[PDB]
Design an enzyme around this catalytic site. Sequence first.
Site, short mmCIF file in Angstrom:
data_model
loop_
_atom_site.label_atom_id
_atom_site.label_comp_id
_atom_site.label_asym_id
_atom_site.label_seq_id
_atom_site.Cartn_x
_atom_site.Cartn_y
_atom_site.Cartn_z
CG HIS A 1 35.91 44.88 49.20
ND1 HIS A 1 37.12 45.51 49.41
CD2 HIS A 1 35.91 44.50 47.90
CE1 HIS A 1 37.83 45.48 48.29
NE2 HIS A 1 37.13 44.87 47.36
CG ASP B 1 38.15 45.98 52.77
OD1 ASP B 1 37.48 44.98 53.02
OD2 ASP B 1 38.40 46.30 51.60
CB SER C 1 40.43 45.06 45.92
OG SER C 1 39.27 44.73 45.29
#
Lengths: 255, 29
Positions: free
Chosen positions: A43, A99, A205
């Site tokens: 992402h 992811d 992230s």
Amino acid sequence: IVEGQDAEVGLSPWQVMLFRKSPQELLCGASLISDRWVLTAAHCLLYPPWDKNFTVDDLLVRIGKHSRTRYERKVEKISMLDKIYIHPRYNWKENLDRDIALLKLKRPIELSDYIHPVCLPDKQTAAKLLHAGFKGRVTGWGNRRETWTTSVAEVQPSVLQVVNLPLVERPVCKASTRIRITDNMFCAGYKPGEGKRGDACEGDSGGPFVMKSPYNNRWYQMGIVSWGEGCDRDGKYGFYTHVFRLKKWIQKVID
Amino acid sequence: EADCGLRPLFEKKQVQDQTEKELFESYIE
């Protein structure tokens, strides 16, 4: 990192910051698993709703840093990327399942006291280490608080941040949210009655969730910071991509 | 690599970091 503390110099030598080339901005975290390979979250690279789809040309990777307030030049490396590998079954539409992304560095790098790769888990290490209640560790330069309006106050460590968080049992993870959680993701963080806090936040992230093996004294990457609802909310947990489950894919893209 | 996960300023130096015991304590709980 919401509720973490300042990392010690040299604490996390596999840390990697994924930057935007111009205007330079920190986009996410990442980790060094070899002298040529960086692991991160898909992402961070591709999210169609926001027309996001970076290429090796708009990206730069920084390595060897534990304090973001200066160009550490001497201990720090900045590298261009050669190639970007995104899992072909990444799911951005429903829950960011699989992811995970691999970045090939342009040229191999020279390891140091501040630059050193972490280990991927093997079958026996994941067995020993993945138990609810066992604590892992998250690092990053992301925001120190979630928030409303602007909240431009604080929320930006000048030093790398650290927080150790416990692994939560799967059924508690499933019941904390109305999003379909899959086997390629695990959640970690404290429960409401544990009093303690801590969570990953915006900009963290793609970063690593590691655990130290007592059998060999080595650090192993067990997850990649992936998503959560807000940051450090009561009754909620952070979700990490399960590295060991995606081990096969990682292996195919390196040979 | 093959010497992955051993840190230059810690493992290699028999120096345990500030918050390491919190992890180990969790294992034997």
